[model samples]
Target chain A: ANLNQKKYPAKDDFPNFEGHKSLLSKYLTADMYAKLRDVATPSGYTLDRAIQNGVDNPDFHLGLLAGDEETYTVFADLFDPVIEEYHNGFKKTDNHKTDLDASKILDDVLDPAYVISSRVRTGRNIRGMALSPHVCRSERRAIEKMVSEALNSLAADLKGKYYSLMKMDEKTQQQLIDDHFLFDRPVSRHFTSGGMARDFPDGRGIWHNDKKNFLVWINEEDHTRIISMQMGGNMKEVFERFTRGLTEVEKHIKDKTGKEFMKNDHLGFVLTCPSNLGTGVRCSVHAKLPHMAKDKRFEEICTKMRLQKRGTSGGVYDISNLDRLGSSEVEQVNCVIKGVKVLIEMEKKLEKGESIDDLVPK
Target chain B: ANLNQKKYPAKDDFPNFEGHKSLLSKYLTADMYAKLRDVATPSGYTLDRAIQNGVDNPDFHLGLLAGDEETYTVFADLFDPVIEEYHNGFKKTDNHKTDLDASKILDDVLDPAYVISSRVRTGRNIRGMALSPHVCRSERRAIEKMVSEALNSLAADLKGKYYSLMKMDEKTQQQLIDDHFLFDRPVSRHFTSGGMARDFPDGRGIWHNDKKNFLVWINEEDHTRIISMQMGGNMKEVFERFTRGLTEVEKHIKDKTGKEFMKNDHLGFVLTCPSNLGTGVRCSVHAKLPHMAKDKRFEEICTKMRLQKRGTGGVYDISNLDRLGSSEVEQVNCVIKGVKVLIEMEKKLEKGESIDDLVPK
Candidate 1:
């Protein structure tokens, strides 16, 4: 039906896709834009249109977006460098192994007072449609249906209902894995330049079990964000359930849809943002590490141990592993296990007025 | 899939769905709401959700919307009475005839000085897909593709391009036949409650011929609004072009997709609102009738002769009236004759004579 030409045409012109400086600004040279200006994917996504958001929004952190899987290779000059930088040198020759396992997990070592809720989630992009940034309303809805079907038929322990965004309120749901919700325009305004902001809430929603531990977010930041979590810091129980639940959900998708999650040798898991490439896993726990965090060297300590920490309130913090590209899910969570144990042990020393600089990993 | 229960659940449960005084308030009785409270259509469209808009908006002119065709017969108690009153008694037994014809046209009476432009259009709903009010995002986009395919294949005279609403600017296009645009939320807020506002500018678009006389509006107020127009009041030319363009577009739809414009015996064409049920034909003109408009009896005259008027500017008024019933040709003929009388009365008024005795059907 000539859909590529009529329905999905390259809309904007060149010279500048937008007013922002993103990964696109860093990699897209004048010569490269001229050479690849006319080049476009089958869906009519041009280089300028793909990078419009990063160009227009000057304060963008990671100004990179892809229309489809083909966009990565079609504009390799731009995407490759962005991928390397965003993912910290995940070379073209390197590959990500799909290894999800839970063995010798440690959660009993931490006290309940020190650790609260735990949520382990991994990003996923489906093989069929364009990524979230460039997907159509119909395609978004279609993926939602497929994923809903996949999750609804899971084993009894992970079974739950899919709630549509149209009529449902956010009060009943708990513990969303992704930062992006149905139309967080200002926070995720970078997504708007690539067609996500328009017709949003239409094809986006949340799904979860009655216990709200296991969940799936559709058409938000990625195609699907499969998550497993609970209110306690039993990392062992959470990781095991996540691995088993993720396996069942993937099995359900393949059994009925004949479709699999998209992946590549270098990228491992193809996520919308380059930051979530390798395992696409974020394993984190909320704990009070006030005294250790206040220590001037605590920031450098987290860097040495490959960890990222976010201040929740005062001394309480949300801590997770920093590296995503070169690790497996098991290794990522194990890093979290070791890092949290170190932080808790450091806090013990600080409370006793001891020098904790010795605990910093050299 | 239990779409009725899960995908299309009845969301808000209450005695008062909204604060609007729409057609829903007039016909929906307290007893009826209670009786049909739990009942729902196959698409999970519930009675409570159907009239939610009417209950919420106090200023709503016509607070009525149906989820699908089945919503009519399934909840006829509320809709039938509204239909009867809205259409001036387009009774269930009063079958409508599909008659598209142009005869005995009178453009000579319209002095170009007096008459400016004319547009004749008809509302249509495709055989497939839900109505605009209750359509899903995917279903709306599918209808867009289907209708675009149907329009692109017309014999060169009508063939042109489909401009997607997502990116097309308004300055290039001219003369949209309907009131609704892509997400004209506040102006047409009545439609928002029925799923029209959520994901707009995604599926709706406009198609036009080379000269732009022949046009089609996809997924707007109606499924397709086939129109014919020009700068001058050439009623014959506009009506003939409209009839032919409508015919070919209809044929193209059936040939390409085996889908027909939704219609039946009693209702000439099925539209979203009951006010547009019958022929759905709007035969209109922009004319200068400042002299006659001053006549105290002019308002009563138009009602008697089946015509309605809205002020364009000063003496220039936009005049067109179709009770929208039984026969499209009859509706057009009534408007044509009505326009002739209006012109005649204007002349008399200009000559310093009274027009109180000239009203007739």
Candidate 2:
């Protein structure tokens, strides 16, 4: 026999767990867990290592993690169902459809008085690179190098400079963050426990144009989060610029270093986390519906419309579509459009002291 | 003047046209029509010449025509919107994406009880060659010879032999046509008037494997219509074989003739009909959905789902919608999703369950 010896606990020997719940904990049975407890991917990531986040953080939602590129396929029995559940029923046979026709959008900000800003963003990972987790420091620096080279060529409205996290001055970082140009936020423990912060801020940076309407966050949740945004209710314009700018950036990266974004027919585009698989596009707006915000049914209708609502002050709600897979970018925007329309209509009726029982979609 | 003679009618002096309105007639405003009336492409395709099919026929839908490759560019104002409208709003600046991976298609077939056959086909034209509409006799014969040589190199399941139309016996020709191996074999007036049949039966032919599951129609609408099909519900296997065979033939053509398919990022694979430009792939299946067929909105729903399931009877011929912008496999995916949904709707109707939830807004 080979010289390897089992060092992990047996099924009964493992301690009982409670509190934190996730797709992983729900799907991984006792026998399966015991069987995989000692197994490791080629990168030396064990089942115990991957599920440690779920065990430690009682509040973690998407608790399990992958250590390297091989983790997805190697752990398919566990990941497949988890992915299906988390991505709103995106099946394995389904491929992402990215219909970026801005012309398909039907309405502008429902009422400009209620729409504060419109934003569209999508994530992309570099091809042939390990995802954030289990990625080495040298590899991180290499990604930063290739991405910086590509950013230097940005011209016209997309023209912007890069600010490396490692080279940042406190004053400059704060200003960028205050202006909403930089993503200076705490890393979720889900990522930290999975080894994304092995060398914190070493290869992180922010790049944006002079107008600050277009931006890129390097080494954030994904290798890059390309964003297009502006004041007022013009999601169509934001998406148009985002789609155009992404095409340009993709071409530039390929021409510069012969590196393309990680994508496939089944997954569309791959990301570090499975939740952001497929188109990885997120369309959102900050809406002010004072009367509706006070209404008990406001956010409930949002949920029914397949939208995720984030409450903020001043009666404004940060609303966005929830599903990224098995849906097109235009569908995502249309979801926002349809939901915001109903919400505004509900708001108006509430102000008029009318019942809103009939407006909910079946 | 050392100028060419004026051989055609003056703009307004031309007789009034009626019947069969095309995108050309719709978008070609009176002023724009007059501006381009006398201008001809290098290939001698004038606006008047291209619009003749629509003017001549009362039933023609895609009434405009392209006479050589130059027709599209020389008459962009007329061709642009027509191409867009016909291909489900695919824009001029949009580049066609081709995905050959067949695994992305979901559902092999809904129920074998309703599936008649599954077929996937696509078109291609040799680079630097004029399309069927304007190809010269000698050039057509040359293409026939070169393609025959490439056809011989096809191996495995795609192993087949070519049968020239001029050489085919009447019995053998009818057998292929009755068996559905050969096309309408039409010289639809559209083709006849567009110079496709200037030398009828000269370079036309059909090629098929021993099993007859894989086939090709040469000197047809485009240069070739590479097709793969079989009796069954397994579209997954059909598309896999079709993509594989097309890839093999493409390699053989490039190696043997040093000429590849004519395609570009924008126009995709160009064809004689502007309607068939771009990926030029079509995936369809003969399906039996008697219950769903009775639904008043059957065809309407198909259109909404980007499908064109043609039939006025119980067993309908279903196919994908857009031929451009999206990839080859994506088209097959559309058929798979649409056909599955149709089958599901049929089952629902049989059980008296409503299908409103399945419909897209």
Candidate 3:
């Protein structure tokens, strides 16, 4: 009955999706829900820092605060339901799968009518070292050395110069960051639980192919953050490039050092933050939603469809999904893709001043 | 008196430069002379493999048989004079120096009339490994890995792709070889001492900039062979590019591995073949010597000037000096530049009705 009085703020706090009540309602029971709220700064996490954002911002995702394996295991009852609800019943029993099948997606995912640009990226950390935030200067250097060797081994198509943050001028640095070709900031508070931001920018660098379609950030929050992105909404090409580049990088490390990346039983790929635990993949598209942004049903539709919206400029927006752990990377991408199509349709009808009475089921 | 009856035929065995007997007469002496002829496969080398070529070719270089440091030091009396003759009195004690000063050479070395192309390249070997002929498959691979890493760190101007010989298909391999972008034949018999060519092409590869001006051959006769070349006779530009690329490569290796290239106290750089000792640099130009090749004055002048010539198609000739030990890289380049000018003058005269009799004197 006292739905509004909770530690991890209840559905009433999220005014943006007022008609939708709480998506968490489907997952968190009264008991398990209180347990998650009671726990503060759980082991292996700077949870308190993320908790502030989780409660303050209605769009905050639980995985941002889910820093370690224990937090995920202990609070599975509370988190799993939220994941399932957003993923539209992506069964927890079904282990997540990743496919970089570029050919299959060439014509399937991109929508020229809505998509302006698309990007796919994933994080990776080398073995035998702490995450970037906690790594010492020497460890960060070692990571740079390892990553450089791997990057150099890439084929001519993926070969490019590595621009070191330590060597870059301020203007060059700012320009790259603005272009979104490089990381905007150093380690954020969310991933600093283990002090992953120790050495600042000493060993940090970025490597992008000549075309800038493929890139890898070295010694950021993780040992390596690989990305593939382009101007238009070509998700297939973007994903294919990312997967191919990542595979080549992974193979080089193995061939040269005979080492492997870290993985856990439940969390497919262990990362600095718990949210990126499963597949550690993020796929996003810049879209235009001028008409839909003004509609009252906009947030409700977004919530029900498990999509997120961030303003880029006038009518341009970044539309993506927030639930990476609950679904396969592809599913997360598919969800946003599906939501984008609906939003485009809704915008078309709104542009014509057509009734939206039958847009959503009654 | 038995000069004509010696165990090895008199330098007459080499008929290419027969008219000018002064070439070998400058170096071969009685005591060191017997040692060269008597020794079958001299110390630390496959000298026997090169012996016929060494004795029968007027352009025969002592470094071809000066296989070891002992060969260089013990027989400096023999090797030094030959080096001095070829490099035109480049004093042995001057201590070799390298310069890529392209500005000085811009006007100094080139003659568009005779020069078809110019190239400057140097050989380097990492310390603690046998040269390519002797190194194992693994060591060859290590060399490729090391060189590739050094190459990748270069700036945009020098950045390029490395084509692995092992991975290249037959067509690509043949095409590169024909273009001279890659090596043509397998390891020459000359460097097979201690079996440096054992692994074949397993650890072999070539790296070249997109423009093809700068290149490197990994796991060749030497541990690494770096080259900078161009189509015209711009010796200064070619040398400058070579030195720049080489300096960058040397710095990268030092910064990454903290090791210097192998060198002997007396020899500036230690190479598997004695010919590449000291400076280990070759500055050569492809020349058009149609008239010069016909006039007897050409051989006489070439002999006096320390120049060697090889015939190429369509009147083109490969002209370079045979001495790297006695001269600095710059001086060696200068020697060839002077000879090329003389040859161009002779060719011009032959083109006119003027006889070469006045040309030589």
Candidate 4:
């Protein structure tokens, strides 16, 4: 294909694993095939066959998209078969069910929902340092309240490491800290969890009504793993770094109720541009679960919530939603209550120089 | 004088500092000034004068030297007296001197040392957070180390409150804590600070060494500061947000030192376009009895160290020695062995991990 370098999926040249295998079979043996099969699995994954191969190609039109000069060069060194399969195409008989029934939905799909905006959010996290884009801007005010209640209720209900969620920053002699600007765009990610980067994103209005569901996704063109869902085995560290103020809330739900939950549960979603991925969002209940939280009325709620609704209410396979998600049928959905009084109260305290510890009872 | 917008300072035209003066003057007249004067003395009073007339026409021509949008606005706000001083004929003033009667050695020459390079070292000590020049790729590796050390020192000195600095990220944090990428050059800075950025500044060898300090005269003819320096304080904040790092270093330093040394220090200089008035030097170091502990040589050692032969010192002022430094100066005369070692180590650490605490401390 004459590739329009600027096009989203670049060129329609997915690596023909079958074709390459046939080409190789004429000269190699069963041992060679064993090595080839060990590395390459092209049966299940689906971003775009052409784009996937293109990324792997030296003449890959989207070489820059795959990475900057440094990343792509390094990525080339680790080029094994499974990596190719995971990055380029799908695996056929993998143990995971999601892997087997996936390409059916992602196939023939283009124009993934999440378009990313690159390089967002810079500055300090202090009040005086607000001279820059210091943390706790007006946008963060709402999340502060949600986190405040989460801390208090969670602390009262449970007794885990999150006991001092509200007062953690206060009690710690040192600090919990990290800083790196996200360099990727909001791709069409296809997963859902709490706490990615942003709670509510604007561009993906597919199933969105206002801002209700916290949807996440992977790169649609290749369905590659997310750039920010880093879970390197330190759940405690992750919780402290990400769940900051909501530790108490999470504890209340987990410890108090003794509910089984993944401590390292992270969020994912797709966006429209290159910079807007991983903005930080978490899910919360409004005292009562939404009627559409688990009902056929979800599409309506999704509409109310400004979500790009594209999924179905079914029991047999639950493949349509996956298809819609993988195909970018809808953008990611994230929901949070705006202007809640509890959040407002916390915002007031934060704005007034009251420590977060003061926002809740000891 | 045929003045262009670039020739003037921003506050001169803006008429804003009167507000700061009104607020500060009230505090000053009441009690603050006397207390500060009694405590800090000369340099403290110098700072008062620097702020006098509300920074209207800054004498230190750092903005002109920095030549970026931020420095441009800095000059714009405070242009009046600076230009007037130059226009009135550069007078013999001791204002440039730090101590020990430097004005005596300096002659009644035209102060060609007008466009001075304002340096805010990324390493430890006071004024660590003040903005300076932007970092380049070549210089970035080195600069980040200094910044990390400065943050660590700040954190060690400040203790619990050090979180205030640590809470910032590398991009915004670096800018806030110790950004130094302010110079407007004819060449790119991306390669200078051991790093590079999106903004590829291009300034080739534009200065003419007519024995007249080339930068001053050349800069006057070329009005570039207005654009780059004018973006001043606001742009500074932007740069800080984007270059956030070294924050942890600041907290660490503060925790260890108990003194807020790595913060709020005003550093500036002048570079007029004449070799004679160039002084070639930026700052004079003071060596009390404890001077040897910091560095035994002080200025004399530095001067002699630069002595290559008779009449010419290899270690002349940065203005005079720019050519030699292009290839020769190790660590750009960062001179302090400890500072250099700490910063180099920082680059190595950042390569291995993300957190500054590991590298910072």
Candidate 5:
């Protein structure tokens, strides 16, 4: 059966591939759009063709070979990452810390997914790695069972993370500490932002910042609301999770700190999407306008306080490829003890009678 | 001139009142409803002649008078609070508060309004307050103009109280707090409540412990969002003002707090109307149900949550007196705030290590 499977390509290779449009044009277009329009009409249509007609059609045979080849390439690119992550969270990293040929790890891990998918067409080699023959023998018949096991392992990991993230760090006793980071601080990880392309059609990073907020508008449609944190992950998904907890904390603050805190305000969102060009991802903060606008009484207090660059809606733009997502999330940074450290350092300077005005937006 | 205005005496004063009904019954054995419909219809006649002929007809004359009296009573009963509040707010309350006494205020307000109303009849007062003479006389005319100014002055007072009850105390700085001492501290205030009469019965008030979050249900039909401060007023007109600050706050909270602070979650509104009985006001809150369900180990948590024990569809039933329009709002203790405070206080106690086992349901 494994030998037979090696000769016959997988099901996805035949139809749902990139060449579907061309295949449809070659085979299905003749009868399809006519019947499609009929069926899509408000009233139901009468079927004129039968299954036998499909089997006998010359066009159908011509499409099969052309369609599958095109599909394999598309599936290979998408499948490699999906299958790896679905089974083992095998995310590709630039280095393996030791820098000892880490590309082999990614290539080796992806081989099974690549090999079995290849079995839908090419013949199996008689001799190879000892494990390859055994995997080729079982082929896709055992894949469903393997996938179930993979999902179970993934679910367990998800459950552990959920509880860990949900846990409230008790401030009073200071007994609370995460044991997972046992030996050392978590190493910083950066995403793949192409070199100067992160700046986009320009040279300078052209970023901006404010005392209370950091907003980088990616354009009109897409932006990310980030709570700055000194320590902790700034991955998009992680920051989104952090936002859920932060929203609750903000509400708690409003209730506990009362009216004055509410008046000063603490609210903002980070927006990032494909559409944002000027500031690839926008981050903004709700700043107190009265403080900034108080000196001469500016008309657009909210705009001025928020550091909106005069006429533009957003005050600052983040152009750093080095910075992770939510690097400027105020709430996240506010919670970090280092944030208090910075404030303490600043307060000492103020005690020496330094002015807040001397500080400029980043 | 007053005599020239239209006047209609009380029903019993008419010689034909009940006397003519029996006289018509002598000719036809028709039921009252059938007889009334038959007389109202005009057969084989021009539209103008048909109406004129019906007016001249004896049964029609008596029916019109009785119908007019019935409609008047309905209007008075339906708009009693609107009348009473307007009247009492104008006359009895302080200079700060407006004219109060609806009957006098309505009478004064309507005098000029009717004189200018082109359809007014020539003989006898149209709706029982003399106007034809007042419309003609110099002194009466001056007085009518003064009365119009006085009544318009009163709209601002009602609007102010409505805003004051809802505005944040810190923002308005308690400009609207009045010390009448007519009710309890809680009873005197209006806040967000997740349960009012439309979801209750037996005129009994039960507390909701999950209604503290500010709620705003936008009704595009009315072009307003029903916004109630987690702590204050619930009015239609303040939607724009509330929205301006709220949109900003929601965005800010999302950034600083790391969550959307002003979300539709724990936010909703009440549907009120004449057809709906009791206060016709329902309070509701959007709970994070999956969280509650898992915590309590209850399946179908939405159904099992505190429910309206009213008739089918959760519609509130009305008492006979309440339905009759003696009171526009049957359960008006500003129940909105009561529900909000109930939850807020309960949470406070739970955090304080006090008993909260009895409060969850």
Candidate 6:
């Protein structure tokens, strides 16, 4: 077995695949795993080579890895949605050009009181290059150099500082994550297993505007995770800034390197994950639902409403649309915005001890 | 809080929601769990009351329990497909009066060599009583008596002994489970929390044919899980037998109890889980797919081919169609048959070192 060594302990270095199991265990069983264990990727990375760290290490990537078409197929249940949500419903076969009409999304329906913050983000990769997970160290640094030049060309309002992780102090790194400005930890075990993180921490960095409303993570999970975010539920403002930033960044990359973003008809924009094959856009809001939070039907209701909730600060929730493959990015955002309205009303009734029972389906 | 006492420990008795996570966690997060915890059902069971035990009980029914429309809607992603497969795409909304035409499903396509066994099953409940989870001991006993009388009226080939779980010896119960001839535990934590399993084990029993080809579990998850199974991949035979047995049982119940099965146009047959709302028929087989089994693209190809696989005996796997909606029984059976042929061809080619590119999509 050609196991790629790493500075970090491998995935299996931790004990207990049975101890901290993923939600996917409900669908993918031990027997199924055993059956798929020895299969080799098209690139000759056997299943063991791709998922060895994952099986042993619970803290990394949830022990999920996909290296080729076959591996991606076997792990599609988990990987598909991850990529799709990141790409904002960009299908695996569709082509994407980074052109956004900010005016397309209106803010009249949004309520600032209910929403703490709004964000719109997308993943982009340069054409004719290995995706981040398989790209070598020098190739990664070269891409960063090119990306830095592109971001510098953006308008003054969108321009920002480039903070390379190798040179940054630990305090700033911690602070970045605390402020939700940092990308995720070094590439996940999933990437390492797929040959994406052969040389870690060498070509990674972060860039953000002076206001910190617009930011970019270089060499994160993908080639880039471009983001536009701000306080309050002003989706219009966030989306406009995000679109402008994204378009300018794309234009600059094209002007400097003359490379279009990787794309196809079936998967919109090509990224590492199949789920993000489409648009790769995600719009989210942090909201408070104190009354509903304590209710037993909350999770079920959220599924029906197509809303996904995650833990945020002070017991507030970060909720967004779960339908990343079936709907357009705008439609998904619209769905979440509309669902938020219902939840706000429902919470109000619960606070006043009034019956909102009629609104719940039988 | 009005907590009902139970003979068994509650789901939370185990530490860490990890001990017993429901399939719902696939889509519903903890934040959502907190928000929906206090919602009440039409039957007066609170959401926590329905799922508290589920959080910590892996032995329970996938830790998933749905009692009302609201609960079903909230957890439809996990519950809907389950219900549909059990009913064989029998939608709760569609009306079904059992009618099976053996000739409707031809036998020329199936390859018995690859197929081990085929089975079809569905759930049914009486209209006026509390569902199995909430029924009192006396009500459960009555249901058993009524179902027993109906089974007694079936043809001798389908006639079988009714073994009550309360009276069965531990050895016999274990043997039945090992033989795959019984339903799961009494009721899930979801049901227990929702006032189901009220008088546990007082009314549970199993009925099976002389050949053990046809069987029924009285008072399992639903009021009844009627089943028809046989060796080989003759879906036509299995489905026909199941349909015939189900019709006879329904007829007997109506004659003896003077009540129709709980059903309506929207939900073909009313049941606790929404996934079983449709035909609730699941047709499955234990087939040998050694070559296809190890192929990395097996699952993706299966999705496109509409086949689901599970590890069975040796290199053999259980494959079935999960699409309970948008396809007919004949169509599903045909899809599986064709996929199996392709799989068999691919396996042969792999073993012989021949090119099977044409066999794969």
Could you estimate the TM-score for every candidate?
0.51, 0.48, 0.40, 0.22, 0.17, 0.42
Off by over 4 Å in 3: A1-362, B1-103, B106-114, B191-194, B325-329, B332-336, B339-343, B355-361
How would you order the candidates by lDDT, starting with the best?
A: 2, 1, 6, 3, 4, 5
Query: In candidate 5, how many clashes are counted?
Result: 58
Error of 1 at B241 (Å): 39
lDDT of each residue in A126-172, candidate 6, tens digit only: 76554553443445676788888888776678867787766467899
Per-candidate DockQ values are 0.03, 0.00, 0.00, 0.01, 0.01, 0.01
**Which numbered prediction scores highest in TM-score against the true structure?**
1
The TM-score each candidate achieves on chain A is 0.88, 0.90, 0.71, 0.19, 0.17, 0.75
Ten-residue stretch with the least lDDT total in model 6 chain A = A1-10
lDDT of 1 by residue, A32-78 (tens): 76666667776555565566556545557666677677777788878
Candidate 3 recovers a fraction of native contacts equal to 0.00
Model 4 stretches with alpha carbons more than 4 Å out = A1-136, A150-171, A174-362, B1-361
Question: What's the lDDT for all of these models?
Answer: 0.68, 0.73, 0.60, 0.22, 0.21, 0.61
Candidate 6 chain B superposition, TM-score: 0.74
Which has the better lDDT: candidate 1, or candidate 5?
A: 1
Report the lDDT of model 5 for residue A230.
20
DockQ of 1: 0.03
Comparison by DockQ, 1 against 2, better one: 1
Model 2, range B43-154, lDDT digits (tens) per residue? 4446655665564443566767666667788888778888888777877776787678867766566567777888888888887666775554445666787787887888
User: After superposition, which runs of candidate 5 have C-alpha atoms over 4 Å from their true positions?
Assistant: A1-151, A155-362, B1-171, B177-361
Fnat computed for model 2: 0.00
For model 2, the superposed segments whose C-alpha errors exceed 4 Å read A1-362, B1-9, B13-15
State the lDDT of candidate 5 residue by residue for B198-295, as single tens digits: 10011111111122122221111110122322312221112223333334434443344343211111111111111222222333222212222223
lDDT tens digits by residue: candidate 1, B122-208? 778876566766654456666788888877887677778888876566653333434322223222445544434433455678888
